[PDB]
Design a protein around this ligand. Sequence first.
Ligand code: J6Q
Length: 290
Amino acid sequence: VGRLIYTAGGYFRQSLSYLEAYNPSNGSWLRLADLQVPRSGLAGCVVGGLLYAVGGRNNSPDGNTDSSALDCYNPMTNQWSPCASMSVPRNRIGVGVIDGHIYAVGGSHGCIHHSSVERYEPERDEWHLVAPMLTRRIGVGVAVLNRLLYAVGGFDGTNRLNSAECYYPERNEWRMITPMNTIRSGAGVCVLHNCIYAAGGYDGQDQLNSVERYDVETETWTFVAPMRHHRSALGITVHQGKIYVLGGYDGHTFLDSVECYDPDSDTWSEVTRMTSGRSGVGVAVTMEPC
Ligand SMILES: Cc1cc([C@H](CC(=O)O)c2ccc3c(c2)nnn3C)ccc1Cl
C-alpha cells in the first residue's frame, strides 16, 4: 500500500503542533492534523497501524509545561485522540514497543531526571510502572531488539552518559551493557538488522556527527560512517531497511536536513528537507492516510 515517515511536534523558537508525513517513494510531504497540544522532546511510535505521541514539553510564551500525555493518530480518519496519561510528565523521553505495548523511559519533569519506566497497554488504555532503570536518563535513546528494550545514553542531571542498559521483561530487571565509545545525549537510537545504532547527540560541549552500533551477539560497539550533519535532538526511524535522521540542532541552526544511511555501502546521503527546521520531533512509520 505504501508507508510514510511521520514527524510530530518539535521545536523552533517554541514547541510545535505540526504533523507531517514524508513519502520516500515520491519525495512528497503532506501536512496532516495538528497535535491538540504543541510539544517538543516527545517520542513517536506505532502500534496496530496507529501512531502515538508520548511525553515532551510545551515550551510557549504562555508558560512551560512538561507533558505526561499519550495521544493517538489514526491515518484512516486524520484525527488525534487522547489516551490515558502516564504516571508522570516526561520531557526528552525515549520509547520502545514490545509485543503491542509501549514503554516510556526516563525523561525530565522540571529538575527531576527520571529513572522510572512505565508500560502502556492499548487493549486496556492503561499505564503501569515497571522496574526503574539503573540510571537516571533524559535525552535517552531507546530501541527494541529480539523483544528486549535498550536505554542508551542521555543525561542524568549531572553528566551526559556513554552508558547503556537492557530491560529483560520476563525478569522485570535492568542490567548494564557495554558502554558506547561516545558520550551522547539526545542521540537518535534505533535498530536495524541485529544492531542497535546511536547516531549524533550532545556530549556537553559539541553536537556529534559520529554513529556507532552495538551488536548484541558480540556485545561491542563499532563506528560506522558519520552523518553529513552534526546533530543533537534529532528524530530517527527505519523505513525499508534504511535509517533516516530528521532535523536536530548543530550548534547553529535548527536543521531541516533529512539524511538516510545505507548499511550495505556504509554511506549517508541527503534525502530531503523538512518543510522547516526543527529539533526534538517524534518520528515513526505507518500506512499512508485516507
Ligand atoms: C531538547 C533535547 C535536549 C537534549 C539534551 C539534554 C542534555 O543533555 O542536557 C541537550 C541539551 C542541550 C543541548 C543539546 C542537547 N544540544 N545542544 N545543546 C546546547 C536531548 C534531547 C532533546 Cl529532545
